[PDB]
Design a protein around this ligand. Structure first.
Ligand code: 7YK
Ligand code: 7YK
Lengths: 465, 467
C-alpha cells in the first residue's frame, strides 16, 4: 500500500490551486442533514491504524508515485518536493491532527464527527489529500447505522409480541460475504454489523475486530451449522427427506439451519418435517432447535404460510402477550430478500397474524452489507477554515440550487446542550465556554494513534435506549 | 490472508452434509436470466485466481489458526482439519480444483455458464463449494464492467446521432468513485472494471491492479487531468471566487482543466465570471486544453440544460453537420453529480431534444458507477449441477415451486456458438455429442496453478461495442 497512490487523481494537482501563503487547511466530516436521524460513528480507528499511522512515506513510494503520475497525467504535476519534505523532516510520519467523536457514539445528523488539519505550514496540501481514504469511513458508519435501525424494529416487535428482548442480538444474521464487492469490504462491513448483533457467517469480520479493536471474549460473533442448496440437492430430487434426516442426525445436539425450498418449501414443511421426520424434531433440545429456512417467493407470504403449516403439525402455545409460539425445538429463519424495509413488513405481518417474533430470525446479505451508498446518510468531507498570510478565514460552500449541500463555517466543536442533546458550534464559538468542553478527542497526531476504543466500549456506546 | 477463514461459516460444516461416497462436486456460475442488462462482460476471475487461490494456500499454521477460531465461533469442534491436512501433505497445500471459464472480456447473454469448478481428487469433494464465497465476489467486476459498458452504449448511440461519429467516446464517462466505495480493495477492482470500457479515471487504485494482474502495452491503462474541488475554490473566500478561477486556469493553461463552478451560484459563475470577467482567459485556450466547467448540484438535467443555455449566449456556438449546437472547442461541460445509468440516459435525451450535441458534455460517476450495484442486478449465482456418488454421476439442481427464475441447470455444462452466432449452454453432458463447435470454457486454474491468462488489452478488445 502506498498513500501517495491512494487519493483521487485531481488531488495530486490541488497544491497548485490553494491561495498563495496558505499555512493551514482545516476540514471536517459530517452525515449532512436533509429515515436515519442518528448515525453510529464507527470505523475510523481501522483506517488510522491500517493506512495512516507510522512511516507511510519512503524514497521508493515517492519514486513509484512520480513514475505513475507522469504517465497518468501525461505531465509532471506530482508534488515530489512536498512528499520529500515529510520523509526528511518527520521520517515519513504525516504531520496531521485528527479529532473525533468516540467510536460507537450515536449522534444526530448534521454534527461534526471528525476534523483534520495539518500541523506543519508546509503541509497545508496534506489535509485534503487524505479526504478520499477518510471518506471511506462512510461504509462502516452506514452499515453500523442501518444494522442498528433494524435492531430497533426487531426490539419494538419482540417486546410487543413476547414481553422481553431475549435473543435480540441473534435475530439478524450476516449472510453477506459473497454479496459484497471485495474481501476487505467483507471484513469492514461484517465488523460494523457486529456493533449491534452477535450472529455472522462473514468470517472476515472476526480477525479485523481482534486486530484493530479487541474484545474480552475470544470471538465477537458466532454461528451454527446450516445447509445450502448443494448439500440437499446433491442427494437427488427423490432423496430430499434422506438429506434432511442425515443433516439433523449429524447435528443432533446443536442448532441446525436447513434450507427447505430446493423443490417445494410447503411440501417440505408439511410432509417431510411435519410428518416423515417429525419424530427427529420433537426429540431435540431447546439448545438445539431445527431452524427451517425458506429462501424463495414473496418473503412475507412465504413466512406466514410456513408458520401456518408448522402450527398445524407441531404443538403451538400462546405466550403471556396472547401471541402464538412454536415449540422451542423449532424456529424459522427468512434469509432471502431481507433489507430494512422487508424486515419491517415481515414482523408487522407476523404481528397482525398473532405470531410472536420469538418464532423468527432474519438473515441478510446484500441488503445488510452491499445495498448502501455514501448518499444514504450524506457522508461528506469539507474544508471549513484556512489560514492565508497569517489570517484565519471561515470557508464554506452554499450552492444556490441545493441548500442541503451548504457546509459549516470555521473551526468546529461538538457540545452537549443544556437539555443533553448534541450541538456543533461553528466559527470557533466553542472557545467561548458557553457550552462546556469539546466532545471531540485527538485520535491521531503526527503519525501516532493517540486515543483508541475496544470493540466492547463501542458496543456499549451503540446500545439501544 | 487465510483461505480456511475466507468462506461463509456454514460451509465449514458442509463436509458432514453431502451424501456418503461422493467423489465429485461440480458447480457453475451464471448471471441468471429473468435497462434489461441482456448481456454481461465476464471480467475479474483472473484477479481472484492469482491473489487468493494459486500456489501454497494451506500451511500447518493456517490450519491451527482456523481450528482455534472455529472452535470459539461455533462453540463446537466441527472443522474438517483432516481434509485440509490432506491437501497440505498430498499437494503441498495447492488446491486440487479445476476451473474452466469463458475468456475475460467476452460479452455473453444472460443465463449462460461463465465458469465451472470441480475437485480433481475424490477426497476433496467438499472443496468445490468451500470456494463459492470467494469466487462469487466476481459478481462485482462483472457487474461494474457490464453497467459501464451499458453506459458506453447509450453514449455511443447519442454521440453518433448528434455528431455523426464516436470521437472521444472512451473519455465520456470518468470514474469519480474512489471515496464512494466501501474499501481500498473494492476501489481497485471496480476502477479496473470501468477501464475495460473507458480510459478516464481518478480512482488511482485501478492502475496498479491492472499492471500487476492483467498488464497493458500502454504505460498506464487510464488517464486524468487537473481539476478543482470545493476546497481549492472556497479557500480563497466567498468574495474571491473569480480570483480562484483565474489562478487555477492560469496554472493549468496548456492542459485540459476541470473547474467546479457551483460553490455559491453556478449560473452567476457561468454567465458573469466565465462568461464576462474571465472570458479573455477561456477564448485564448487551445483545442487540446479546454476549460471544462463542472456543475455539481441541482437537478442534473435542468442544471446541464441551463448551463448550456448560458454558455451558448456568452460564447460562439456553431451548428454541426447533423444540425446540433456545439460550443467552441476550448469550452466543455462535465456533469459529475447524481450520475447513474438512468440519469445519464435522461441527460443525453434531454440534450438531444434541446438540439445540443453530446460532443459538448462528459460525465463523472462515483457511487453510481462503483457502489450502487448488487449481486442481484444480474442474478450472479453459483450452484452445484453434477455429483458422482458410488461412482455414478447424477444431474442435480434446485427448482423452487414459488420462483421458476431460481431453477438451476442440470449436469455437466458447456458453452457453444449457435449456427446463427449466438450462445447456448448445453446441459447433462450433451456438449460431448459435439453437435456444436468447441466448448468456449477453457481451463484457467488446475491443481494450484493459473493455466491461462489474458492481458488487459485482449480483455478490452473482447468487450468492444459492435459499431
Ligand atoms: C438465527 C438463528 C437463531 C439463533 O439464535 N442463532 C444462534 C447463533 C449463535 O449460536 C446459538 C444460536 N442462530 C441462528 C441461525 C444462525 C445461522 C444460520 N445460518 C444460515 O441459515 N445460513 C448461513 C448462510 C450464509 C450465507 N447464505 C446462506 C446461509 C444460510 C441460521 C440460523
Ligand atoms: C471528461 C473530460 C473530457 C476529456 O476528454 N478528458 C480527457 C481525459 C484524458 O486526458 C485528456 C482529456 N477528461 C475530462 C475530464 C477529466 C477529469 C475531470 N475531473 C473532474 O472533474 N474531477 C475529478 C474528481 C474526482 C472525484 N470527485 C470529483 C472530481 C472532479 C473532469 C473532466
Amino acid at each position: 500500500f502506498n498513500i501517495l497512490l491512494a487519493t483521487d487523481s485531481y488531488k495530486v494537482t490541488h497544491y497548485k490551486q490553494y491561495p498563495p501563503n496558505t499555512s493551514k487547511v482545516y476540514s471536517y466530516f459530517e452525515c449532512r442533514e436533509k429515515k436515519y436521524e442518528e448515525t453510529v460513528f464507527y470505523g475510523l480507528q481501522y483506517i488510522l491504524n491500517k493506512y495512516l499511522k507510522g512511516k507511510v512515506v519512503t524514497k521508493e513510494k515517492i519514486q513509484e508515485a512520480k513514475d505513475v503520475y507522469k504517465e497518468h497525467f501525461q505531465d509532471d504535476v506530482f508534488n515530489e518536493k512536498g512528499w520529500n519534505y515529510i520523509l526528511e523532516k518527520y521520517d515519513g510520519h504525516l504531520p496531521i491532527e485528527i479529532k473525533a467523536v468516540p467510536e460507537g457514539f450515536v449522534i444526530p445528523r448534521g454534527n461534526v464527527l471528525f476534523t483534520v488539519e495539518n500541523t506543519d505550514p508546509e503541509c497545508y496540501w496534506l489535509t485534503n489529500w487524505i479526504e478520499t481514504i477518510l471518506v471511506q469511513s462512510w461504509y462502516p458508519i452506514t452499515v453500523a447505522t442501518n444494522s442498528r435501525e433494524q435492531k430497533k424494529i426487531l426490539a419494538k416487535y419482540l417486546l410487543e409480541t413476547s414481553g422481553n428482548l431475549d435473543g435480540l442480538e441473534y435475530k439478524l444474521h450476516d449472510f453477506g460475504y459473497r454479496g459484497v464487492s471485495s474481501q476487505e469490504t467483507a471484513g469492514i462491513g461484517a465488523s460494523a454489523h457486529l456493533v449491534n448483533f452477535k450472529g455472522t457467517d462473514t468470517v472476515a469480520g472476526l480477525a479485523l475486530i481482534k486486530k484493530y479493536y479487541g474484545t474480552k471474549d475470544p470471538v465477537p460473533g458466532y454461528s451454527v451449522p446450516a445447509a445450502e442448496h448443494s448439500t440437499i440437492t446433491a442427494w437427488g430430487k427423490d432423496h430430499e427427506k434422506d438429506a434432511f434426516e442425515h443433516i439433523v442426525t449429524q447435528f443432533s445436539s446443536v442448532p441446525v439451519s436447513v434450507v427447505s425450498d430446493s423443490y417445494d418449501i410447503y411440501n417440505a414443511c408439511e410432509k417431510i418435517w411435519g410428518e416423515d421426520l417429525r419424530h427427529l424434531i420433537v426429540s431435540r433440545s431447546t439448545q438445539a432447535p431445527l431452524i427451517i429456512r425458506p429462501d424463495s417467493g414473496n418473503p412475507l407470504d412465504t413466512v406466514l404460510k410456513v408458520l401456518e403449516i408448522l402450527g398445524k403439525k407441531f404443538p403451538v402455545t400462546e405466550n403471556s402477550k396472547g401471541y402464538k409460539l412454536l415449540p422451542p425445538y423449532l424456529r424459522v429463519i427468512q434469509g432471502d430478500g431481507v433489507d430494512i424495509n422487508t424486515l419491517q413488513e415481515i414482523v408487522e405481518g407476523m404481528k397482525q397474524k398473532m405470531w410472536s417474533i420469538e418464532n423468527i430470525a432474519f438473515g441478510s446479505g446484500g441488503g445488510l452489507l452491499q445495498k448502501l451508498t455514501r448518499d444514504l446518510l450524506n457522508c461528506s468531507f469539507k474544508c471549513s477554515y484556512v489560514v492565508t498570510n497569517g489570517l484565519g478565514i471561515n470557508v464554506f460552500k452554499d450552492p444556490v440550487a441545493d441548500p442541503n449541500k451548504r457546509s459549516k463555517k470555521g473551526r468546529l466543536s461538538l457540545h452537549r446542550t443544556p437539555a443533553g442533546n448534541f450541538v456543533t458550534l461553528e466559527e470557533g464559538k466553542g472557545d467561548l465556554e458557553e457550552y462546556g468542553q469539546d466532545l471531540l478527542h485527538t485520535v491521531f497526531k503526527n503519525g501516532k494513534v493517540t486515543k483508541s476504543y475496544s470493540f466492547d466500549e463501542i458496543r456499549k456506546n451503540a446500545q439501544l435506549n
